[model samples]
Target: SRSYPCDEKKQNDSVIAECSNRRLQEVPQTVGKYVTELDLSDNFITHITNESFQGLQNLTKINLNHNPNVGLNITDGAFLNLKNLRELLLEDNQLPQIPSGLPESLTELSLIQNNIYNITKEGISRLINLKNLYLAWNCYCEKTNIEDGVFETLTNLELLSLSFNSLSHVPPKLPSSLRKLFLSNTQIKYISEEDFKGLINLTLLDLSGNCPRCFNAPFPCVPCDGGASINIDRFAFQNLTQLRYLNLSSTSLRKINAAWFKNMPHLKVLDLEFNYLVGEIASGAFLTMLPRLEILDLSFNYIKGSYPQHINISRNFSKLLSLRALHLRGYVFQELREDDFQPLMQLPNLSTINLGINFIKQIDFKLFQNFSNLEIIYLSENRISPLDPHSNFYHFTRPLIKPQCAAYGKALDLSLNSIFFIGPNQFENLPDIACLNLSANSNAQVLSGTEFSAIPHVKYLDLTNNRLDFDNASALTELSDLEVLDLSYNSHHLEFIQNFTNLKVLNLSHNNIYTLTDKYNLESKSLVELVFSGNRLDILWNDDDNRYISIFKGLKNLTRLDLSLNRLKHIPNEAFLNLPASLTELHINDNMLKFFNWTLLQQFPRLELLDLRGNKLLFLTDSLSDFTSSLRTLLLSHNRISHLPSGFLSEVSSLKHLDLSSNLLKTINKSALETKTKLSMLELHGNPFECTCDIGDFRRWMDEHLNVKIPRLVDVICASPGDQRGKSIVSLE
Candidate 1:
């Protein structure tokens, strides 16, 4: 291993140096400078004396993401000079007490995932300009009583997150201008009927992450997906008249009565993500409560746990014609009977449907005879395999020989089954199906293209994770209108797909192909989102005229390309120059590349997600920093070596999510990021961190703000001081 020489001069104007991993026991004396960003996370600092950031006048963005500071104690004017600072993140730290006097200029502050509990009026008085505040994932032992004047100081607040606490109730005086509020995983026993009286402008409210087991516990036992019964707390949501988003996940309420949501006409989105609510939904439930609902999430519940183990969805949902997205999961109907979706057929405006992770064996054709407007249907993780493909599968009737069962429905999904190998004419009459997912089945082989004379208009076909090979191309011959085809997780040869001219999106990932040649007439012009990851392509570009050149040449309209997890060592300059300007996402992670040419990233002008995780590259040089402007998500985890390039990442103006976890770096350069950087999520777990004197700025940032998910905060200790590696850094304070 060769060491890259450390050049302090390279850490220039745009970068701030707060190396918490190096040797030291306290704040560095020459710390104050004209820097705007600072990082001192994962270190062993005990306290913050007065004048901690003495001369850093122009500092704007500070990161104390994870530290050992027990409290956020600060001097009277500790933040006097940072007038332009916008975001202060301090999530996942050991702060027991927050210091008084918050900066009125602070707009976004995070004290979430901490151990503080006090919400006194004095602490609230200092944050008049606060816009977004997160106090979730903590043990705030104080009893919350929302009485008068509790919210008098937070007039400008917009969003507040307070999940995973032990509060008994919410403050009655909610800020009128508040837009979003989270109250999940708390010991909220009761609430004043007028708790939401002041929040007239509120739009989003989340109460899903709670610890409750049942929706309403007398055990309604609705036979949901796995026979779980979720009780619904009708009264808890009655007062949210102005709310548009409501989450009632994992409450385990069995029945949804009409009175639960009688007058919530303004509610548009409702999420019941996880719970046990099994039984036939009461007919009056949706008729009175869900007239205006547009999006509903009823996942992870036992619908068959109710009195009648066999689930039944009555016609109650038919009245909520405004629904656009409906998520239902449960073992409601084992066999596709006549009235399976009898009521859902009445929903003339339904668009997106997620009915996956259930136990439906055979869905009678008549079940979907009326869903003419559905767009997306998720039937993954089910047991609908070993289908008699040559049977009346495509036909609307039950039996071709016995024409008496002509009442079967059309337009359906039969994915995630055990049986493989569909007989010819299996989908003989399912022409209305625009999208079908036959992935994750048990069949080793399948009938190819022309077997489906009934499906000329099917566009999206998913055959991923199956036993397909080169011999299966004959079954794929006649599909001329196919747009998106996923052939990933198989042992198929690429030579089989020689000429699918109209194909747009193709996923051939996790296969056994080693090379590519331009001898075929495959049309890649209309292609978008080509995935060839996790394959046996030892060499990315073969010896002849750059092997991948022919593949890229055909893809003129490519928007997203994923070539991750291969054995490539180098990339040619012209490999991606001919790519369409519409290319917005490029995933090349998990490879053996040591370096990349600057032109490779500059080719995509609209790139959004740039994933370079799990590679051998050590540094993110200044040349690659320009690619950060268009990247929304940047993942560089599980790489080798340390020391991020100075001022290399500061140029990323629009980067939002960054993951630097599982790396060999012991320190993070504070000046690495630019001011006003639109960063939201920063993950830096699984690294051999060295905590020393350089951790003071990182500690300060953790104490002042609390929004970053700092997993190292719990285990950050002094690696050299011998007395502190295993102990939390904040325990010393």
Candidate 2:
């Protein structure tokens, strides 16, 4: 029935017409000629003559980018009858040139950030089957006018993006069937060697922000003395022998040119990070220049060396032997110079190694004792100091100088190290360690009970802000496949959280240990999310509702329950009447809640996110439309909500996301959200909105529902029209 209006489908055998943004000033002649993809980007269409896409003719992709205002005409043979046009997205338009007789069966063409200064050669000489050519940030800088054989008849150009242009060079006769070339934030300070002459099928080369002559005036290029650089020249990528990705990281080159990657024999990802690198890389320099390198990012250069300026790694990367993933993150060394990872134990498929942050106070865990396909080991933020609660981990394996791992599963990130304590078999020689981040170890106090008795299937355990106090149930009863347990801001209590019976998310937010007591011995029935935020749980209203329903009576598959900033006032409806009807999210936001016992949330008929934001909630009756009919996010903001009774949101038919911001709403009842067609995020920002005419039909239903998302619709002003006080009910009529 729907031939062309908007979103229509049908993939195989084409047919996808999505008249974007729809404020169409033109391009909508009931489109459908079996529309072969047409999005009309963010519409406000100005012009596109040549009969503006005369009858679709099986249009093959056309997204007229952000149509900026002002008679934006696209005259000259406008697309010459979509000869099955294969993609032509005019990015952020304001176009100035190249829109002439386009369709030469274009294989993707985007005039990004358009204002097109000039590019001659008869404006894209009829796109010779163009294979992706995005003239990024059109205005080609430095007096624009490209001219000279403009991209020499594309010749099936393979991805060429003139990124953030300003050009000072490298734009003379390119297309040798190029393969991915993005001149990033261009100004082209220097590259010479005939600037990649004919880019021998270049394989992804992004000159990250081409450093335009030095300048560190405000440090965005600090590699020393007036930043910005990049001088290449020497055999500049010797005819990019099928280059496989090369990004001169923050092109402030300070060293490492071992022939700037000699004869790139299939270079596989090499990004020379930031740079200020004080040299010393030569010496088999990456196994004599790019020996099939596999991802090597020399993180934030200036390798803080001096132990005779480090770098020896058995004479520079033990014959590169196809190195595998190695990013020296912010190499702020502190010590680990077994001649810099002792030639990575002769690279046995070295799998991921990022020496994070770094201040290394110690680490000798057998220095990766023979790579063995080691799976990711980012020595997190390093400081490595304490941890000796009666050493079973022997002063915690003595600043781990040679930790061994033959990868049987490893994602070990020694979180912000300086471990205070956690003895007993300390990770019993890593039994397949799986996700363990010892949160901000501020002298992480005790955890000994065979400290994770041989990684008992650890599944995400971040002891946030550690100080530890889990009343020891033999220190986490051997994490029986723990599922996301972040004991937030710890000083933990609740005696071993029912010994984590396959806990499915438990945060115990900002602890102070307030009773959830029914006299222990409650075997966690797969508890699902229960964050007791900023604790001091004062849940009033005859507090002992069977010890608050036996403290979640072994959470029967409970679904999200956060007792936010626990100053909870009155709760009784039998204190959550034994929650878990698969309770769907219920956060008692910044508590001290004022009367809201709608029969205790109608006993969770699958409640969906009902966060009573910053409590003291005043009005919301109509018996909460019979207790939120399967609500879908209803956060009542900083309360004192002035009145809403009449069908208050007519039975939340899966309300999308509503928040009565800074409440005390003067008037809202437009039949209380006229059957919320799945209300999409509505927040009455900082109330006090009353631009008379009783908010003119909610400002004409918020300007005729422009895909509802009132995010403080221009700060919803007007307490009274003292000349429309602080205006904006969308600038009052």
Candidate 3:
């Protein structure tokens, strides 16, 4: 009862009348004359008979997504009139079987995320131009028993996704020009090296999230499964040396023995996670085996040993010296010793290492003592409480030679541990420690600057969520070369201050800082990333501190500021305006404010993450309404917003996250939020929603085809008059 029928004489030409979600049951026959797209999705249409498309002659795309239509009984020529139809999408309907007599002009078909099986050429042979077919995520059999020539007629098929079907075998032979194939989770057992003969031009083959245990080969120790053993015909992959990506996850791959890939010289990525192979790697596991391998994944397997696994893993990897990334998850060896990484001493080209969630209690620093050019290393979730002091640990490792790496060690992370109280000369070996993360530790304090003075090459120091203060002058001045410092969570009476020249990234959030000048000393010129959230700063400073302004004057690179949860009644106009042009992201949420000044904000064209949530604002002004360009994310949640300014958001066409939750909103003006279709996350929870006749256009847009993420569509209720006290907002009565 929600559809408004067009005038009979001029039926479907341009029927633009908007109606509520009610009164809409069937496809109104009068809308077929000129309607090219009919969206019956997200509706209560339970039955679609042959006469459904009787007058829909020009309908090219019909979206029946997420409806309760149980079946579609089509007559012989019921849809023959829709000759211009190119796509037939019927996803998420309650159909149990394929409909008969499909249209011939349909070139692309999607029956995905439905409950249908028994798909044969007999039911879909009418369409000759069907190039892309998606039958994924249905209750289809885990193994395909279709006739041999079921795909013989479709000559133009290029991309196919049978990911969730019961396809046990590689469907006899796919088309010759097929580019991509997804056989993931289809109960695949055997893939004779010859199974991919016809797909010679295949670019990406996804067998991940599937079953490949039938070919558990090369090593016989792996238990036999329902499938046959893996013989790995020599000539099978001999011609596929040019393969780009291969995934053998959760399979019977115990060991990658010698000559396993005799001729695959151009393979790029190989994934081998989740197997029952146990024990340390013996010598010739992969030495020089995959010479051109770029990415290798060996995660989630029963590898033996401890912190530094003792294995021939290093020697095997030394062969592929061209490796850019290597992943060997889980502790495969028992104990880590000096000989563990002696093989990797020659792999100068390695860059990334992921050893997260391992059993590594203590790893010798000598393991990485030679990676002079290494960029990124992840050793998170380990047991190393503190880094070893250079003089002592280095002198003990090699008595004959002075530590060769005097200027190479930088960016060490000893976080998530219990060890505390570092000695005076802890960083003597790591003079180049740039980015240090000592976060999430107890008894962590900066007592002496001596330990840091030796780390002259330090840049970023992260000490968030720790029990420490800056009163220790010896530990504070040790970072004279620091650019970014964070001391967010600790007791501070605001007493200790240090003069920083190249210091930036100062974060004092979650502290009892009642005054800004208590313990902060700004030397002027190179400061950025100033955050003072969760503090007692009831005021902001302006113009007096040359020590502060002089620093901002030189730090043309100041960007990303956070001053939320403070008592600032009125923002000083000149405080942030004098900042360097590099300022982009700003956060000033949860404060006492009435309006915003775009003239002061628009100075930085590249501002992205602007968080002004929980402020006192009735509506934006004309200047902010017309403001545009470069702003991506905006948070205005928890505000007193009864109405949005006219043309309020027309300028920010690139806005991504617009959060207006916990507001006093009663109605939404049409085109209130306009953009270039770049809006992604829209949050309007906890609002006084009023769904009167004024919301007719928006209510209709929400009930149509499912494209935009309409959050809490039903939960948004009217909070206006006594009659509509708790009525659901989706009820557009």
**In order, how many clashes per candidate?**
69, 14, 25
lDDT of each: 0.61, 0.69, 0.59
Stretches of model 2 off by over 4 angstroms after superposition: 1-74, 77-98, 101-120, 124-148, 151-180, 183-314, 318-341, 344-365, 368-448, 452-472, 476-484, 487-494, 497-572, 576-619, 622-733
**For candidate 2, which ten residues in a row score worst on lDDT?**
388-397
List where candidate 1 sits over 4 angstroms from the true fold.
Answer: 1-61, 68-77, 80-86, 140-149, 209-211, 214-239, 255-257, 303-311, 388-415, 423-431, 492-495, 504-507, 513-733
RMSD of each: 12.4, 18.5, 10.5
- Listed in order, each prediction's TM-score against the native is 0.63, 0.38, 0.66
Q: Which has the higher TM-score value, candidate number 1 or candidate number 2?
A: 1
* Residues 565-682 of candidate 3: C-alpha lDDT, one tens digit per residue: 8765556556557655676888889888776676776677878778888899777654563454677888898889888655554565577667877888777776664332456556
Q: Which candidate achieves the best TM-score against the true structure?
A: 3
For candidate 2, write residues 496-553 as lDDT tens digits.
6567667677887887766544344234677777887897657323434344444565
